[PDB]
């Protein structure tokens, strides 16, 4: 989406035609970026009639070009878009510190694990994803490749027991940062009974935060869960993984967005320090053209 929204802004710049049908031109291209990438059309929409509205109310300040102006503009209404300028806090200053992972059926865990192992942490993995039998062996590998201890109960089905054991025996160890792993037996659209299976576990283990992993590749169907979600505690954020496996990220980025949660992080690629703090404006500042 952004990288098309470059060459979009680039054609902008190079003033070709007319201020208002180039305007015209690039509106239009926008919407159907923000349409092709899955952003709800009320979103797309009221995007685009912002962009107009301030267009009309706020000349360019002075020596500023018009169509800089203009982009200028349409840079800050796509961080809005996104959430806006925020920075997330992702150093936590209470130890020990309890993560716990939750989201749908479908490396996050470990990649999490990295980046606080990279920041001088003593960090402990709790593989409790049950469900999928491969996970904890596979986690159990990032954990081996990493160098962070992984916890975890092979055929054990019990995933509040294994989180519970889990946790107790890393506190015991004086861990630093624990993450637990889990997943969930509901998709996207029982998102109900997908929160209400949450509770259980996160009764028994008490974390100090709460993490919602979505994958990209929903777009905006996100929304749904994301809202139930953020609403339901105090201490939950979110995570969007594969934005560079779909076409989609836009949608889920503006549908999280839309819930006002906190995505702290975002999985770009598929290696391990393949994870990145996000902030909407960041994001959204890589292509700017100036650069």
Not at 156 to 171: C, S
Not at 261 to 287: Q, S, Y
Request: aromatic content about 8%.
């Amino acid at each position: 989406l952004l990288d098309n929204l470059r060459d979009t802004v680039r054609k902008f710049l190079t003033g070709s035609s007319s201020y208002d049908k180039a305007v015209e031109d690039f509106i239009k291209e926008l919407q159907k970026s923000l349409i092709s990438a899955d952003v709800n059309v009320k979103l797309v929409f009221s995007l685009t009639n912002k962009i107009k509205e301030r267009l009309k109310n706020e000349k360019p300040p002075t020596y500023i070009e018009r169509r800089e102006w203009f982009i200028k503009i349409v840079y800050d209404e796509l961080s809005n878009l996104f959430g806006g300028d925020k920075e997330p806090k992702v150093i936590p200053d209470k130890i020990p510190y309890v993560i716990m992972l939750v989201g749908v059926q479908g490396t996050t865990a470990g990649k999490l694990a990295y980046f606080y192992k990279k920041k001088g942490f003593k960090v402990g993995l709790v593989g409790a994803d049950v469900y999928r039998p491969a996970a904890l062996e596979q986690l159990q590998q990032l954990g081996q490749q990493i160098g962070v201890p992984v916890y975890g109960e092979p055929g054990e089905k019990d995933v509040v027991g294994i989180a519970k054991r889990g946790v107790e025996k890393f506190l015991s160890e004086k861990m630093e940062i624990i993450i637990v792993d889990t997943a969930g037996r509901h998709g996207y659209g029982e998102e109900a009974a997908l929160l209400e299976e949450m509770k259980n576990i996160y009764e028994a283990i008490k974390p100090d935060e709460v993490t919602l992993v979505i994958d990209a590749s929903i777009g905006q169907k996100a929304y749904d869960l994301a809202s139930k979600f953020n609403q339901a505690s105090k201490i939950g954020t979110i995570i969007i993984t594969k934005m560079d496996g779909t076409a989609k990220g836009g949608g889920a980025l503006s549908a999280v967005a839309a819930t006002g949660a906190t995505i702290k992080f975002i999985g770009t690629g598929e290696k391990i320090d393949e994870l990145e703090v996000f902030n909407p404006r960041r994001f959204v500042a890589r292509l700017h053209h100036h650069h």
